[PDB]
């Protein structure tokens, strides 16, 4: 449901082919929040339950609303937590293809983490989806040090956080349809582009 720790719980001897790491929005529950479960169900349909590990960013990432105002759009502790998960994935399953995503503060977190990541691990992330990307204007719709072709940003018209503000308006809470269709579609396509099928 809203909590998935497939990577942490998973057996190193039976690694999934695809590992998805996702960061939730502010004040959201579990480690997947409102959008993560919809993406997860679709990835499982495409790769099979044993074919993909779903891992939310929990631990030190508290998804505190106030942290949106910090320099990177999230806390240093949260960035350290997500970096640790990518590092755990790389060590536990070196042959797995990675994919990632985040919503709101989680999108800023995914961007900051990917920016700081060792290039060798970052290069294994086949695609990343960002919803209501809080640093969209500041970063010009990109994740620093990560290719544009592997990035997909979902920013609704009227969602003030995509336009340099930190005000939460109704469009910021309307990413449900994207999480159910285009977001997983993009992730599946990017994984197949490199793994084949």
From Swiss-Prot:
Catalytic activities: cutin + H2O = cutin monomers
One BP annotation, GO: carbohydrate catabolic process
Compartment(s) where it occurs, according to its Swiss-Prot or TrEMBL record: Secreted
Post-translational note: The 2 disulfide bonds play a critical role in holding the catalytic residues in juxta-position; reduction of the disulfide bridges results in the complete inactivation of the enzyme.
pH dependence (record): Optimum pH is 8.
E.C. number(s) listed in UniProt: 3.1.1.74
Stated consequence of mutating residue 26 to A: Severely decreases activity on p-nitrophenyl butyrate
Main localisation: secreted
Practical application: May have promising applications in chemical and textile industries as it is capable of hydrolyzing a variety of substrates including soluble esters and insoluble triglycerides. Can hydrolyze and thus modulate the surface properties of synthetic fibers such as the plastic poly(ethylene terephthalate) (PET), or the textile fibers polyamide 6,6, polyester and acrylic.
SUPFAM superfamilies: alpha/beta-Hydrolases
GO cellular component, one term: extracellular region
Gene3D superfamilies documented for this protein: alpha/beta hydrolase
Site (described: Transition state stabilizer): 26, 105
Documented effect of changing residue 68 to A: Increases activity on poly(ethylene terephthalate) (PET) and decreases activity on polyamide 6,6
PANTHER family (UniProt xref): CUTINASE 1-RELATED, CUTINASE 2-RELATED
Function per UniProt: Catalyzes the hydrolysis of complex carboxylic polyesters found in the cell wall of plants. Degrades cutin, a macromolecule that forms the structure of the plant cuticle. Allows pathogenic fungi to penetrate through the cuticular barrier into the host plant during the initial stage of fungal infection.
Name of the protein described by the UniProt record: Cutinase 1
